[PDB]
Design an enzyme around this catalytic site. Sequence first.
Site, short mmCIF file in Angstrom:
data_model
loop_
_atom_site.label_atom_id
_atom_site.label_comp_id
_atom_site.label_asym_id
_atom_site.label_seq_id
_atom_site.Cartn_x
_atom_site.Cartn_y
_atom_site.Cartn_z
N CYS A 1 -13.20 -0.31 18.71
CA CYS A 1 -12.85 1.06 19.08
C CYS A 1 -12.36 1.05 20.64
O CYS A 1 -13.42 0.53 21.42
CB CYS A 1 -13.83 2.22 19.01
SG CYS A 1 -13.45 3.89 19.74
N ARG B 1 -14.41 3.79 23.63
CA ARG B 1 -15.72 4.06 23.67
C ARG B 1 -16.13 4.17 25.18
O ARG B 1 -17.69 4.42 25.33
CB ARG B 1 -16.40 2.66 23.48
CG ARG B 1 -16.63 2.20 21.87
CD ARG B 1 -17.27 1.11 21.39
NE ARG B 1 -16.07 -0.16 21.69
CZ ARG B 1 -16.59 -1.29 21.98
NH1 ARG B 1 -17.93 -1.70 21.99
NH2 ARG B 1 -15.49 -2.31 22.16
N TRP C 1 -10.04 11.44 19.51
CA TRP C 1 -8.64 11.90 19.76
C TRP C 1 -7.63 10.97 19.63
O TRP C 1 -8.27 9.85 19.81
CB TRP C 1 -8.61 12.95 20.96
CG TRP C 1 -8.98 11.98 22.13
CD1 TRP C 1 -8.37 11.14 22.63
CD2 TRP C 1 -10.17 12.51 22.97
NE1 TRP C 1 -8.99 10.74 23.91
CE2 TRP C 1 -10.24 11.58 23.88
CE3 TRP C 1 -10.99 13.42 22.62
CZ2 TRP C 1 -11.24 11.28 24.66
CZ3 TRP C 1 -12.25 13.27 23.41
CH2 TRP C 1 -12.28 12.40 24.50
N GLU D 1 -1.24 4.84 17.59
CA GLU D 1 -1.72 5.03 16.30
C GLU D 1 -0.56 5.65 15.48
O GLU D 1 -0.39 5.22 14.30
CB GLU D 1 -3.06 5.70 16.11
CG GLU D 1 -4.21 5.07 16.97
CD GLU D 1 -5.52 5.84 16.73
OE1 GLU D 1 -6.40 5.94 15.76
OE2 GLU D 1 -5.83 6.47 17.70
C1 HEM Z 1 -12.60 10.08 21.78
C2 HEM Z 1 -11.57 9.19 21.67
C3 HEM Z 1 -11.52 7.89 21.01
C4 HEM Z 1 -10.42 7.09 20.94
C5 HEM Z 1 -9.40 7.08 22.17
C6 HEM Z 1 -10.52 6.15 19.97
C7 HEM Z 1 -9.66 5.12 19.65
C8 HEM Z 1 -9.73 4.39 18.84
C9 HEM Z 1 -8.64 3.49 18.32
C10 HEM Z 1 -7.00 3.23 18.82
C11 HEM Z 1 -8.92 2.58 17.06
C12 HEM Z 1 -8.09 1.77 16.32
C13 HEM Z 1 -7.93 2.64 15.19
C14 HEM Z 1 -7.05 1.88 14.21
O1 HEM Z 1 -6.10 0.85 14.46
O2 HEM Z 1 -6.85 2.14 13.12
C15 HEM Z 1 -10.32 3.00 16.99
C16 HEM Z 1 -11.28 2.42 15.87
C17 HEM Z 1 -12.41 2.84 15.63
N1 HEM Z 1 -13.31 3.91 16.34
FE1 HEM Z 1 -12.49 5.11 18.04
N2 HEM Z 1 -11.61 6.51 19.25
C18 HEM Z 1 -12.35 7.40 19.60
C19 HEM Z 1 -13.37 8.05 19.05
C20 HEM Z 1 -14.40 7.22 18.31
C21 HEM Z 1 -15.73 8.16 17.82
C22 HEM Z 1 -16.12 9.32 18.28
C23 HEM Z 1 -16.00 7.07 17.08
C24 HEM Z 1 -17.40 7.24 16.28
C25 HEM Z 1 -18.33 8.21 16.62
C26 HEM Z 1 -15.19 5.87 16.93
C27 HEM Z 1 -15.38 4.55 16.40
C28 HEM Z 1 -14.49 4.02 15.94
C29 HEM Z 1 -14.58 2.90 14.90
C30 HEM Z 1 -16.13 2.41 13.91
C31 HEM Z 1 -13.45 2.09 14.70
C32 HEM Z 1 -13.12 1.07 13.92
C33 HEM Z 1 -12.21 1.87 12.66
C34 HEM Z 1 -11.79 1.08 11.79
O3 HEM Z 1 -12.34 -0.05 11.57
O4 HEM Z 1 -10.77 1.65 10.99
N3 HEM Z 1 -14.30 6.30 17.61
N4 HEM Z 1 -10.76 3.92 17.91
F1 6J0 Z 2 -10.77 -3.70 7.51
C1 6J0 Z 2 -10.09 -2.67 7.22
C2 6J0 Z 2 -9.12 -2.87 6.17
C3 6J0 Z 2 -8.22 -1.72 5.69
C4 6J0 Z 2 -8.16 -0.55 6.51
C5 6J0 Z 2 -8.84 -0.76 7.54
C6 6J0 Z 2 -8.67 0.56 8.54
C7 6J0 Z 2 -7.25 1.09 8.58
N1 6J0 Z 2 -7.13 2.07 9.55
C8 6J0 Z 2 -7.43 3.26 9.17
C9 6J0 Z 2 -8.51 3.95 10.48
N2 6J0 Z 2 -7.88 4.38 11.76
C10 6J0 Z 2 -8.31 5.45 12.25
C11 6J0 Z 2 -7.80 6.56 11.65
C12 6J0 Z 2 -8.17 7.92 12.29
N3 6J0 Z 2 -9.13 8.20 13.23
C13 6J0 Z 2 -9.57 6.84 13.67
N4 6J0 Z 2 -10.30 6.93 14.79
C14 6J0 Z 2 -10.56 8.13 15.21
C15 6J0 Z 2 -11.65 7.69 16.31
N5 6J0 Z 2 -11.75 6.48 16.32
C16 6J0 Z 2 -10.94 5.93 15.23
N6 6J0 Z 2 -9.18 5.59 13.24
C17 6J0 Z 2 -9.75 -1.75 7.94
#
Ligand code: HEM
Ligand code: 6J0
Lengths: 411, 407
Positions: free
Chosen positions: B106, B109, B278, B283
């Site tokens: 993420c 963070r 947000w 994305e």
């Molecule tokens: C508040 C603004 C936030 C921004 C700008 C942000 C940004 C991002 C971005 C760009 C990714 C990559 C997403 C993708 O490529 O699919 C990501 C992944 C992730 N974020 Fe955030 N995030 C935010 C909030 C949060 C929050 C509130 C949480 C949890 C409480 C969180 C937990 C995670 C996790 C676990 C991933 C990995 C998700 C996955 O593997 O699909 N993020 N975040």
């Molecule tokens: F290891 C993997 C295998 C297949 C899909 C995958 C995640 C694909 N992306 C979807 C998650 N991305 C998104 C979508 C909406 N919102 C957030 N999000 C919001 C705050 N931080 C992240 N992340 C991982």
Amino acid sequence: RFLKVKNWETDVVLTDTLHLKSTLETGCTEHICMGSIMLPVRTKDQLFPLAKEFLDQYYSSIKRFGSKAHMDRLEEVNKEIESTSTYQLKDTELIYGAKHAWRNASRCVGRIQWSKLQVFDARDCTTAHGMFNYICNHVKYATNKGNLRSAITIFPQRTDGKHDFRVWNSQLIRYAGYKQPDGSTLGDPANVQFTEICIQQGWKAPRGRFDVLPLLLQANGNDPELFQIPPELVLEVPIRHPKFDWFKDLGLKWYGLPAVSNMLLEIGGLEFSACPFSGWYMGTEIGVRDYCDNSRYNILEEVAKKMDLDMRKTSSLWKDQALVEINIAVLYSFQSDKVTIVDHHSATESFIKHMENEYRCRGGCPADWVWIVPPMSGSITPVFHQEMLNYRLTPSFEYQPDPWNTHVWKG
Amino acid sequence: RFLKVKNWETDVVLTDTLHLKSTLETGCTEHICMGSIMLPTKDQLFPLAKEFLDQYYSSIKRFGSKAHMDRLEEVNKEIESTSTYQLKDTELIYGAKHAWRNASRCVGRIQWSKLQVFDARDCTTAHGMFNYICNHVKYATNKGNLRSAITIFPQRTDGKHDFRVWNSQLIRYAGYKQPDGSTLGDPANVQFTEICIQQGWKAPRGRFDVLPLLLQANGNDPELFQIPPELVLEVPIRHPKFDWFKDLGLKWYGLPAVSNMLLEIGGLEFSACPFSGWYMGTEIGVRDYCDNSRYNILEEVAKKMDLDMRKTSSLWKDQALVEINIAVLYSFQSDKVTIVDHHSATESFIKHMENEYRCRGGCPADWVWIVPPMSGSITPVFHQEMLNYRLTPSFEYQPDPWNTHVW
Ligand code: HEM
Ligand SMILES: Fc1cccc(CCNCCNc2ccnc(-n3ccnc3)n2)c1
Ligand code: HEM
Ligand SMILES: Fc1cccc(CCNCCNc2ccnc(-n3ccnc3)n2)c1
Ligand SMILES: C[C@H](O)[C@H](O)[C@H]1CNc2nc(N)[nH]c(=O)c2N1
Ligand SMILES: C[C@H](O)[C@H](O)[C@H]1CNc2nc(N)[nH]c(=O)c2N1
Ligand SMILES: [Zn+2]
């Protein structure tokens, strides 16, 4: 064991067995991944198994494994080792070795070309003047008037570590960098330190923005000597843009031949500390990294200004917009001058096909995702969506410390 | 064993000590790096609870205190007798914030400590889940001034009474396989949509149909609900220069809300824990819009720009890509919906990395995920070495429930 990699764009799954043949360490453990870390005197003891492993691979590749020729060669090398403490490669083995070091290079996206490598055997070289002549010939051959040909020149291997051949340049052709008293830099900031050494060694610097550096060549462990590559052998391309006529007035140009000269080639446990190699450029190397890294020529601003982009807020993506135009200009200029270059779409698409072919024929293809994915437009190239496994196979290219940090000066 | 990370653009070097507290495994070995692979009992439970409670009590400067010892004592008794234990509200909030803090993929963070935690552990039915989720959505959306939130449903017991949100995100668009062979809507969501239909959804077969929630409570069969359209903030995508851009008929939703991950805290498992932040602009503009297996609009856009699409070397794809991402940012900003561009977001992450190294001894980070999908090396994270490792509390992936569900 069998390892699977998946392409998330195409759902193509490939199976890796080749990783079982890996010996060297990655830097990662079960508890930490060092995938994004840039960088994570040999006894008879260690040497024969290394020789044996290599000769087994060589003889398998020529379908003569277990032959009398194979067995005699192992015997000859074994005796030569404990008699002389090292051994000499046959020409065929050296050529095989160099090609496979490139084949095994996990950071190189151009490996579809690996089997077409021109190998220049410079193992009879004894002096820096001799090194200069070999390198001139490499440059002329590889440049080929703009129709670039891959090549490697291989100088004598390490013996006691006190008689190393080294090319002190990081690349055969690069531009000087000069740190000014006001803290600014003229030319290429990456090369300030090497430039200063050159000057100390007696180089007369023109002190311009694109001065081709002299060669600093060390033979047989002796102090390095300076040589100027004949300017007629250095092919350069003035950079212009197909639509923007002001782009030429930025005064940009680049050299056509990308030639890495500071790595170490390991083949069957032997170490070739001087082994300059060259291919051709992928456009982003120049347009993204060389021109646009903050720590390099750093031209994004000036370009963006001339384009009259909104530079007040990053969300205008002015940097992204200028970046594209610069990379258009680089490709345009090289193509127009009939100098070999490949765009990042073509190159990554070819790598994917290479990679799949290698999985089928070889059981795998070690690849460093972090380096393979281009420094712009990542996910619109197929490599972004491709899972890769990174591991180390020999023969290989390795990093080595810069020679000015290790060299024992003769005076 | 004391590891250093270097930024190759600034020469800043940080020392990582935090990785030595990592327990879970990376998939990597000394012989193979898997860094680009997407998915590499009472006796088990107490050391996990202990590890967590120790870090919690250390965080509030009461390590080794009687309240610490008492709590450890109380939890241990509870595990012995009940086979599980219940987190205090303070522990749940701490754990959720740290799961985010530890999320190596993420980039956002820097915001980790400003997370609104909604405790939904009293929820018993899918209808109650819908209510909690509508409330989350309304709170997080906040009329376009987005606020990070997580809603935490009851923890796993015997794995037979799992709470699950079947959706991958609270808000996504439907996908339909058309007989003409193509795909209408989001190709990423064909499978889920067919399960929406098999279960009863009346699909309008459009291109941007906001999917319904499929909610599973207490291990029971999943139920369908439609999110009130008035709670789903969407943004029509226009370009500030190209008046034709609006004709493409594109829009996206404001709230990115991941709903299919598993939150692990002190050995306890929260299988239903939707969270939201947000968007970073890329994305939507790079991945959602330009991935070949998603909306895949590059070619249409390139034509409308009248680019030479004959040769890859004209970089028409690259040029269209930038403009699409320009329009996304412009549209959200104009409609006053929170969005962050990839330059600002990565710059903030570098600041966060430095804070973390300084105050915590490290920051686990997955470079493959942190570096944006466009313009990588003109963002600072490209030049930043990162170490990836797994700390708990954590968000983990888990299997899609349609494979697991004993109907
Ligand atoms: C508040 C603004 C936030 C921004 C700008 C942000 C940004 C991002 C971005 C760009 C990714 C990559 C997403 C993708 O490529 O699919 C990501 C992944 C992730 N974020 Fe955030 N995030 C935010 C909030 C949060 C929050 C509130 C949480 C949890 C409480 C969180 C937990 C995670 C996790 C676990 C991933 C990995 C998700 C996955 O593997 O699909 N993020 N975040
Ligand atoms: F290891 C993997 C295998 C297949 C899909 C995958 C995640 C694909 N992306 C979807 C998650 N991305 C998104 C979508 C909406 N919102 C957030 N999000 C919001 C705050 N931080 C992240 N992340 C991982
Ligand atoms: C023929 C066309 C070639 C192309 C298009 C190509 C492409 C590339 C690119 C883009 C890189 C990354 C460079 C960087 O980011 O600094 C690279 C690295 C590398 N290539 Fe190639 N290459 C070619 C030829 C060769 C040859 C002939 C060899 C060796 C015989 C080779 C071996 C390597 C090695 C060892 C690296 C890693 C360099 C480093 O770690 O600094 N490549 N290649
Ligand atoms: F691990 C590292 C830490 C610091 C620098 C580093 C090498 C940086 N690469 C710049 C040179 N790359 C170049 C230059 C010219 N030509 C090629 N080239 C030619 C064929 N294949 C690559 N590659 C590694
Ligand atoms: C820190 C990170 O590993 C480093 O900046 C890498 C990223 N990927 C790269 N990829 C290529 N091709 N060349 C590079 O120099 C780098 N640098
Ligand atoms: C195969 C590769 O690991 C995969 O495409 C990754 C690359 N980096 C990513 N980075 C982010 N932020 N999100 C992703 O989905 C991916 N996909
Ligand atoms: Zn790894």
